[PDB]
Amino acid sequence: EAEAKAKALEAQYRERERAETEALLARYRERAEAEAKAVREKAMARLDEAVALVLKEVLP
Amino acid sequence: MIQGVIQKIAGPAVIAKGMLGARMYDICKVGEEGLVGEIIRLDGDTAFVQVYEDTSGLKVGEPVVSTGLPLAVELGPGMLNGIYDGIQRPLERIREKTGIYITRGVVVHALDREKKWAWTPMVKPGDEVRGGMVLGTVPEFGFTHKILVPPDVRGRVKEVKPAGEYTVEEPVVVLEDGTELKMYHTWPVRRARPVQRKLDPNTPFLTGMRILDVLFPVAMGGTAAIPGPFGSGKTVTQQSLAKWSNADVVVYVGCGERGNEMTDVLVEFPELTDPKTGGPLMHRTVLIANTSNMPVAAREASIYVGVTIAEYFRDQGFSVALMADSTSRWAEALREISSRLEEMPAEEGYPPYLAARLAAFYERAGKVITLGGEEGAVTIVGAVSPPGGDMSEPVTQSTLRIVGAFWRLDASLAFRRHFPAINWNGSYSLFTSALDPWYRENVAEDYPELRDAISELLQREAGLQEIVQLVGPDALQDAERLVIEVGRIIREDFLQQNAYHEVDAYCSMKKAYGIMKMILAFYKEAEAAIKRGVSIDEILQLPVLERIGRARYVSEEEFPAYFEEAMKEIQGAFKAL
Amino acid sequence: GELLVATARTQARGEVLEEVRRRVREALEALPQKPEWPEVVRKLALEALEALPGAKALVANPEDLPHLEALARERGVELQAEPALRLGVRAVGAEGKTQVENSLLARLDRAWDALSSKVAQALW
Amino acid sequence: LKKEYTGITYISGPLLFVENAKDLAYGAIVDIKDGTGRVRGGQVIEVSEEYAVIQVFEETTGLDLATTSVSLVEDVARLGVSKEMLGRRFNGIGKPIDGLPPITPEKRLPITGLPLNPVARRKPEQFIQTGISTIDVMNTLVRGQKLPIFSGSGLPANEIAAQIARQATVRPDLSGEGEKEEPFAVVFAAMGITQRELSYFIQEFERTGALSRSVLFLNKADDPTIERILTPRMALTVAEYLAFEHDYHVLVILTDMTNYCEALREIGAAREEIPGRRGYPGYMYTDLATIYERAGVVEGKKGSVTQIPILSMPDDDRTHPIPDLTGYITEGQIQLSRELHRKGIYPPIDPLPSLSRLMNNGVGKGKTREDHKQVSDQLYSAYANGVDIRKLVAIIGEDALTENDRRYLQFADAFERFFINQGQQNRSIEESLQIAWALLSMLPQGELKRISKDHIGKYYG
């Protein structure tokens, strides 16, 4: 019974570990793509303020 | 092709003039003969060539011609079963060409340019090739010598010459750039060959000697250093590392060591047989010899040519073992060219960049994935020669900060003809904790615990030996005499190799585990026999101690039944006591 | 996972700065078709002559020949015609042991650092 | 603009001499390019009106004199530092090797630092526990301190440094404030490690998850041997920035300073310069001082720098100039012993040749416990009695010793097996003082002369 409960709790918490680990990591992937898209889409409309500034400060 | 004349000769250092635009660390042909030198210390339009051959009999006025290329090895099929010197020239072709004396200034090609090799392509027109990928195989002896793209060449394959048999100089692949890939390719010897990723080493370098893999192991991707004064062997240990290993190929580079070792290695290796594939042993050795009376600057290039050929066989998937003998003679070569070049030294003449050079050498060992996807490794065993004892030398302490395993020989332990002379009070290895799951799968289950018991018993014996020498043999009560005698059985039965006996030389892990289990079972059952009132002097002449003591001579085939019979003798020989 | 989201964020942030660098690289490539082009080229040549006291040779392009010949008849210079340059001019000093290039792409690539600070601060 | 200079007269070793260079400022960075377009860093270390010496920061293979223009960049040597480098990795020059974009530099600081004002320092005062029992009880590590780990050649220095990285915390309930738990930010300055020690540090920091708080200036062993000069300076630049303008608690691990002193010996022997001891130059004290003394806490601000240099003592002594001058600049050392590691003890810290000069500021009443300094002093005296009575055992043999002499011999090896020996366990300060009293209870009263009477009355047994 000691070996059986050891093996059963092992398989139980490794199922738990596997499922919750992949459910966490895919959600972090989703939120990471959302954050990258959000900062790029905020920067695109924000652009062309920059290029005139850098071309003004490089040129005399 | 920057061409000039000699302005000054000073030792083997030719200070040429008229060179304005020769690149540093090129290789220039000095003299009217065609001697070989490497160029350093540019000044104005005045170079500083060092020659690699002898230099006597030259004049002032002879042209020096800069080739405009660094020191390049050639890499390809036809290097196994072969001897080279420090600039990769085959010694058999020199012996055929000029005599039994290594003369100055003779140019034979490294790879023989007329042997017909079978070709089996593995690319097709309209494929893409990157650096390090395979283009097809060539069958060499019983290996499968796959040929590589050079590591700075990529593009698209335009044509492939078909299956047949060819020559190493013939351009077999043509890309869609006009470039043509031959069989061999040149590589600059000091720029290290690239990798994708370095892994961690977790598989042991089995070296066939009991102490050097049981008590101080070294992984497949690690480094080890063997010091030792004269008369401490070290040459039979390097040759045993070369003869009896699991590594697929062996580069044996000897920089500044006597010629009798090299003629031993060259003569007797076509009669032996590696225990992996049959055939000769000499068909997996590339040996780069540079004898002591050969010139004193070629010792520098001998090591780099050896390690670049070792990385070439590492990139093909083969697990390579590099035995670099007498790196302190390379240190003296750097001292000679430094004190010729008039630099200020540090700590007995050695140039201050010495440990950076030794780190650049011992860094190339490892266990990588190659550029062609597959996995390879290379391990460096470097024999250091200090003057006498004297582990406080600059080269010894400068290689000591780098090496993963340290194997210290002694003279006092070798003047009693106890070979190998591995002093286990001072030797160490960092690869013990990393090689434990391999042990626990592939030799035993309790194997680390068992050799930790061995190490505890040896430390106990060596600590108690001092008061044994002081008071004499009497005052040790009951079981400390047993600690002495079990320690003597260990250092006369498990640690002492022969390497000349036909079956004691190679010792796999199972037989070493067996002898270890014999000795620990004898010790535990003798302590169980001495906790009840049996005289210690009675136990020390039982016959089963002889069955343990001659158990390094039972063969690999004859071992396991003998092991079980010695276990039941160990049991049934203490029942009467 | 937090390293995953942070590295995705910083590489997405970096490539937009790369494309702003692309826009200014092309808008400085398409500068030699403009009516103030001899003005800006002779201004940059005057600065390059100013920072190197007493030059000898002034390297310019075969396209960059006619717009600055009034410079090539004063200040002791002698002009050299070479298409090696894409933008700007070069000042060869004492005995060829000193050059001062004042090309535009080189000015962008050297001055890019604090300007990248101000570009990222302006866009965020 | 971008000026250039041709006319390199002389290239040898790490040095090359440009001429007609009066506009190269002293200490300025140059970049060298040959015909193959590859650039190489360098720095000026002499300017004349005639010519100018330049040290080369990479390998000098492939240069020539018909080409190789030397251009000027960054009038004094500077590192561009932002706050966004808290997860990155860099080489010795300061460039990212992780496939990621280069940073957006908010400030750009001079690399060599400016000496910190002794009026505007604060006393390093707040107790860090490190888990290691010897360091917590006997040689205290206080936040804002420089203490190197003097190690041998095969000793596990890297594991002790990684253990102090993974479990050093400050306990404010003993201190009396609470007030938060903001953890440390590691700056790992590696000078010439060999991918084995590097793989151990990276695997440890990634299993504990510290790489989202730690910058790593990795200079591996095959990388050229001159930028080891640049590495600790452009690590402590970021350490001073992140501690004294953004209020973090930066812990710096300066790996293997013997490679830095080797690089100084190289560049001091290539300049024909006055040696000190064993060939190292004269100014090695000043350069190790201007690395080390860029640490501590300041007055009226929030941050803290804690330096752990790592030393590879060459012939495991305190007489070589590298551990010797290191011990002169720093405040205390932790020294590892070859004997205890042969006996199998981890961490093999022998407490006799190790000390910490800032212990008395950050221990004692209201900061650790009322018995801390006295327990430390009695452990030192009794373990010293054990050490020098083992020599008497080695001389005359045991059976001419009486009982109180044998109690010290039992104290010494019970000390070495139970107080020092701990495999990766995080014994805090209360449990370590409990084990210290459990070892002091092997000695009778009248032989504990450095502990006050109420302490020995209430804690004993």
Swiss-Prot record, chain B:
<dbReference type="GO" id="GO:0046961">
    <property type="term" value="F:proton-transporting ATPase activity, rotational mechanism"/>
</dbReference>
<keyword id="KW-0813">Transport</keyword>
<dbReference type="GO" id="GO:0042777">
    <property type="term" value="P:proton motive force-driven plasma membrane ATP synthesis"/>
</dbReference>
<dbReference type="InterPro" id="IPR031686">
    <property type="entry name" value="ATP-synth_a_Xtn"/>
</dbReference>
<dbReference type="GO" id="GO:0005524">
    <property type="term" value="F:ATP binding"/>
</dbReference>
<dbReference type="InterPro" id="IPR055190">
    <property type="entry name" value="ATP-synt_VA_C"/>
</dbReference>
<dbReference type="Pfam" id="PF16886">
    <property type="entry name" value="ATP-synt_ab_Xtn"/>
</dbReference>
<comment type="similarity">
    <text>Belongs to the ATPase alpha/beta chains family.</text>
</comment>
<dbReference type="InterPro" id="IPR024034">
    <property type="entry name" value="ATPase_F1/V1_b/a_C"/>
</dbReference>
<keyword id="KW-0066">ATP synthesis</keyword>
<dbReference type="GO" id="GO:0046933">
    <property type="term" value="F:proton-transporting ATP synthase activity, rotational mechanism"/>
</dbReference>
<dbReference type="InterPro" id="IPR000194">
    <property type="entry name" value="ATPase_F1/V1/A1_a/bsu_nucl-bd"/>
</dbReference>
<feature type="binding site">
    <location>
        <begin position="228"/>
        <end position="235"/>
    </location>
    <ligand>
        <name>ATP</name>
    </ligand>
</feature>
<keyword id="KW-0547">Nucleotide-binding</keyword>
<dbReference type="InterPro" id="IPR023366">
    <property type="entry name" value="ATP_synth_asu-like_sf"/>
</dbReference>
UniProtKB/Swiss-Prot annotation, chain C:
<dbReference type="GO" id="GO:0046933">
    <property type="term" value="F:proton-transporting ATP synthase activity, rotational mechanism"/>
</dbReference>
<comment type="similarity">
    <text>Belongs to the V-ATPase E subunit family.</text>
</comment>
<keyword id="KW-0406">Ion transport</keyword>
<protein>
    <recommendedName>
        <fullName>V-type ATP synthase subunit E</fullName>
    </recommendedName>
</protein>
<dbReference type="GO" id="GO:0033178">
    <property type="term" value="C:proton-transporting two-sector ATPase complex, catalytic domain"/>
</dbReference>
<keyword id="KW-0813">Transport</keyword>
<comment type="function">
    <text>Produces ATP from ADP in the presence of a proton gradient across the membrane.</text>
</comment>
<keyword id="KW-0375">Hydrogen ion transport</keyword>
<dbReference type="GO" id="GO:0046961">
    <property type="term" value="F:proton-transporting ATPase activity, rotational mechanism"/>
</dbReference>
<dbReference type="GO" id="GO:0005524">
    <property type="term" value="F:ATP binding"/>
</dbReference>
<keyword id="KW-0066">ATP synthesis</keyword>
<dbReference type="GO" id="GO:0042777">
    <property type="term" value="P:proton motive force-driven plasma membrane ATP synthesis"/>
</dbReference>
UniProtKB/Swiss-Prot annotation, chain D:
<dbReference type="InterPro" id="IPR027417">
    <property type="entry name" value="P-loop_NTPase"/>
</dbReference>
<protein>
    <recommendedName>
        <fullName>V-type ATP synthase beta chain</fullName>
    </recommendedName>
</protein>
<dbReference type="InterPro" id="IPR022879">
    <property type="entry name" value="V-ATPase_su_B/beta"/>
</dbReference>
<keyword id="KW-0375">Hydrogen ion transport</keyword>
<dbReference type="Pfam" id="PF02874">
    <property type="entry name" value="ATP-synt_ab_N"/>
</dbReference>
<dbReference type="InterPro" id="IPR004100">
    <property type="entry name" value="ATPase_F1/V1/A1_a/bsu_N"/>
</dbReference>
<dbReference type="InterPro" id="IPR020003">
    <property type="entry name" value="ATPase_a/bsu_AS"/>
</dbReference>
<dbReference type="GO" id="GO:0042777">
    <property type="term" value="P:proton motive force-driven plasma membrane ATP synthesis"/>
</dbReference>
<dbReference type="Pfam" id="PF00006">
    <property type="entry name" value="ATP-synt_ab"/>
</dbReference>
<keyword id="KW-0813">Transport</keyword>
<dbReference type="GO" id="GO:0046933">
    <property type="term" value="F:proton-transporting ATP synthase activity, rotational mechanism"/>
</dbReference>
<comment type="similarity">
    <text>Belongs to the ATPase alpha/beta chains family.</text>
</comment>
<dbReference type="Pfam" id="PF22919">
    <property type="entry name" value="ATP-synt_VA_C"/>
</dbReference>
<keyword id="KW-0066">ATP synthesis</keyword>
<comment type="function">
    <text>Produces ATP from ADP in the presence of a proton gradient across the membrane. The V-type beta chain is a regulatory subunit.</text>
</comment>
